[PDB]
Design a protein around this ligand. Structure first.
Ligand SMILES: Cc1cc2nc3c(=O)[nH]c(=O)nc-3n(C[C@H](O)[C@H](O)[C@H](O)COP(=O)(O)OP(=O)(O)OC[C@H]3O[C@@H](n4cnc5c(N)ncnc54)[C@H](O)[C@@H]3O)c2cc1C
Ligand SMILES: *[C@@H]1O[C@H](CO)[C@@H](O[C@@H]2O[C@H](CO)[C@@H](O)[C@H](O)[C@H]2NC(C)=O)[C@H](O)[C@H]1NC(C)=O
Ligand SMILES: *[C@@H]1O[C@H](CO)[C@@H](O[C@@H]2O[C@H](CO)[C@@H](O)[C@H](O)[C@H]2NC(C)=O)[C@H](O)[C@H]1NC(C)=O
Ligand SMILES: *[C@@H]1O[C@H](CO)[C@@H](O)[C@H](O)[C@H]1NC(C)=O
Ligand SMILES: *[C@@H]1O[C@H](CO)[C@@H](O)[C@H](O)[C@H]1NC(C)=O
Ligand SMILES: *[C@@H]1O[C@H](CO)[C@@H](O)[C@H](O)[C@H]1NC(C)=O
Ligand SMILES: OCc1ccccc1
Length: 509
């Protein structure tokens, strides 16, 4: 793609759920207009009538989502129930965020684009059409992805990774490969955000109807088949929508949304649903189970001279750790989730946020219901950070190479004092301390935001993403896989939306 404004042509078929029919009928119903939901609804609309339902509002109502400068603002903003960012604290005690807006998480993310690790396709066991996967990537890339310009700090970090030994230089590539590279960005060179909601423009306007502020409460069932959905609007009125012959309901509500909805619909572990007075429709002990979040571990350096704020574009990739940095302006209001707690020091000037990601992870928790009736009340979530010791070992290696990174001649001009050690840097929060690095990771863990699981392929779904037992029901979002496709997963899930959509249209033909 090239540099342009955010395309809002799709708004002609966007309605508030208050202005939709009491009893609707469509060929396909997609729940959650997010990273996978938006391309899925658009792909299916090329031949059949599609309803896309979204609990959040349209992005124009919150303009700071549409720029690179306003990334922190959305996290800084108070969660009133209507805002595009929803705040939650996991049972682990770590602050986190999720999207509540048309376009989904792509509207509020750091904008880093990357294609999946090629080994991911083979290790899943699913028989992927590799040629179609690549064409789908190109389809996403020609719409919302650009080659980023040179950024002073990002180029410093890129030069630092190579000096630290993360080899080789891959140059500009979208592929998740070992070494250092400039990757793709969904922020354009003009600073305009380009997200999943723009892929709705690529679907047929006569077939697709998008309903914002549509709080999907329950999936309806009748051999067991999914017949439709119940969703409530701004006014509180219940609506019903149903699928036609050979049509399907697909759940794209996310890692948190999808398992919560499935459990509310009576699809989950038997004894658990019975303990909540929910009529069990389909027993499956894996709904809400196996929920993962990759650990973020970080250091903040405060350079003596001001540095230009930048979007994350240059990645340092190894098998056991994924590394990147983001330079930011200072703030008096803390951006929620960026740091694990609100009890955290505020930056006095422009700072560099330098992070490392643990692959997997092998540590897992669950999504469980807090309310047995209301979908608007957020479910309980636990990740069990570093419950597995291999994840802690992978952090140790990552902190060591971040240590190596600070020792580079590339990052040398950003030291406050001209001293041999890395204490020459000024730090916001906790600096780098073999047993000493274990404690640093356990105490100063943040969420990388790349959480996945809850409705796994091979546990809840088959190899074609259909929920086991139930006919005419599928799940396409981040809840589907137990491990990461790459360091930054949006690119995979944007592709996955169209991919499954194209597979469904193949079946019908
Ligand atoms: C702050 C942040 C920064 C990130 N940075 C990057 C990055 O730089 N690069 C990258 O590749 N990835 C990044 N990620 C991770 C990545 O964006 C997500 O893992 C991914 O987009 C999840 O997509 P999804 O489709 O599964 O869920 P979403 O995109 O969230 O889609 C789900 C949609 O369903 C809606 N919904 C939920 N329940 C219901 C319901 N009952 N009825 C109707 N609608 C419902 C939600 O409001 C949401 O809009 C970031 C994530 C966060 C939070
Ligand atoms: C360059 O950046 C600016 C700001 O991101 C864009 O200005 C927006 O333009 C649309 C109409 O095209 C308006 O609805 C918005 O209100 C503008 N935003 C702001 C913050 O002023 C501009 O479109 C971008 N241009 C290109 C070619 O990418
Ligand atoms: C911004 O805040 C940091 C917070 O610590 C200050 O960094 C310290 O600076 C002194 C020298 O003035 C060092 O002896 C300390 O070791 C630094 N602390 C850490 C944790 O690294 C920094 O000085 C502040 N900025 C300004 C301009 O005063
Ligand atoms: C798919 O894309 C990757 C790079 O993204 C390339 O190396 C590979 O050869 C492609 N495969 C096919 C089957 O087109
Ligand atoms: C890609 O995935 C494989 C497992 O399928 C893993 O061993 C490898 O480390 C990954 N590559 C990178 C560069 O992370
Ligand atoms: C970590 O996960 C692996 C999965 O292969 C498993 O063998 C082991 O039980 C876990 N280890 C710990 C220490 O929890
Ligand atoms: O993934 C890039 C990133 C990491 C941490 C904070 C902001 C952006």
């Amino acid at each position: 793609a090239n540099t342009s404004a955010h395309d809002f042509s799709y708004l002609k078929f966007v309605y508030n759920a208050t202005d939709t029919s009491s009893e609707g009928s469509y060929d396909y119903i997609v729940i959650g207009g997010g990273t996978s939901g938006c391309p899925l609804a658009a792909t299916l609309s090329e031949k059949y009538k599609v309803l896309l339902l979204e609990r959040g509002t349209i992005a124009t109502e919150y303009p700071n989502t549409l720029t690179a400068d306003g990334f922190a603002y959305n996290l800084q903003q108070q969660d009133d129930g209507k805002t595009p960012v929803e705040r939650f604290v996991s049972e682990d005690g770590i602050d986190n965020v999720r999207a509540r807006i048309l376009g989904g998480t792509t509207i509020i993310n750091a904008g880093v684009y990357a294609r999946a690790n090629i080994s991911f396709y083979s290790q899943t066991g699913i028989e992927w059409d590799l040629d179609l996967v690549n064409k789908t990537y190109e389809w996403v890339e020609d719409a919302i992805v650009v080659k980023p310009n040179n950024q002073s700090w990002q180029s410093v970090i890129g030069e630092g990774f190579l000096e630290a030994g993360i080899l080789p230089d891959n140059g500009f590539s979208l592929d998740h490969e070992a070494g250092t590279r400039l990757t793709g960005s969904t922020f354009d060179n003009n600073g305009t955000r380009h997200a999943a909601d723009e892929l709705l423009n690529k679907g047929d306007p006569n077939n697709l109807l998008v309903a914002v502020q549509a709080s999907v409460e329950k999936i309806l069932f009748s051999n067991l088949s999914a017949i439709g959905v119940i969703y409530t609007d701004s006014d509180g009125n219940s609506h019903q929508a149903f699928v036609r012959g050979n049509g399907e309901v697909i759940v794209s509500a996310g890692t948190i949304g999808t398992p919560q909805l499935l459990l509310l619909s009576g699809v989950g572990p038997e004894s658990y649903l019975s303990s909540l007075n929910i009529t069990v429709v389909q027993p499956n002990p894996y709904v809400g189970q196996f929920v993962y979040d990759n650990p973020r571990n970080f250091i903040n350096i405060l350079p003596p001279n001001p540095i230009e704020a930048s979007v994350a574009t240059v990645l340092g990739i190894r098998s056991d750790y994924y590394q990147v940095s983001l330079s930011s302006l200072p703030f008096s209001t803390p951006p929620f989730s960026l740091f694990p707690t609100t009890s955290y020091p505020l930056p006095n000037s422009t700072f560099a946020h330098i992070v490392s990601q643990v692959p997997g992870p092998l540590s897992h928790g669950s999504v469980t219901l807090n309310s047995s009736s209301d979908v608007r009340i957020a479910p309980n979530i636990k990740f069990n950070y570093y419950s597995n010791s291999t994840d802690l070992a992978n952090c140790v290696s990552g902190m060591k190479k971040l240590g190596d990174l600070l020792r580079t001649k590339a990052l040398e001009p950003y030291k406050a004092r001209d001293v041999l050690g890395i204490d020459g840097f000024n730090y916001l929060g906790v600096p780098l301390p073999d047993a000493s690095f274990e404690t640093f990771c356990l105490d100063n863990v943040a969420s990388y935001w790349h959480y996945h699981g809850g409705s796994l392929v091979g546990k809840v779904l088959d190899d074609s993403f259909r929920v086991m037992g139930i006919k005419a029901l599928r799940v396409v979002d981040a809840s589907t896989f137990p491990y990461e496709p790459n360091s930054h997963p949006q690119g995979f899930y944007l592709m996955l939306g169209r991919y499954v959509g194209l597979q469904i249209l193949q079946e019908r033909s």
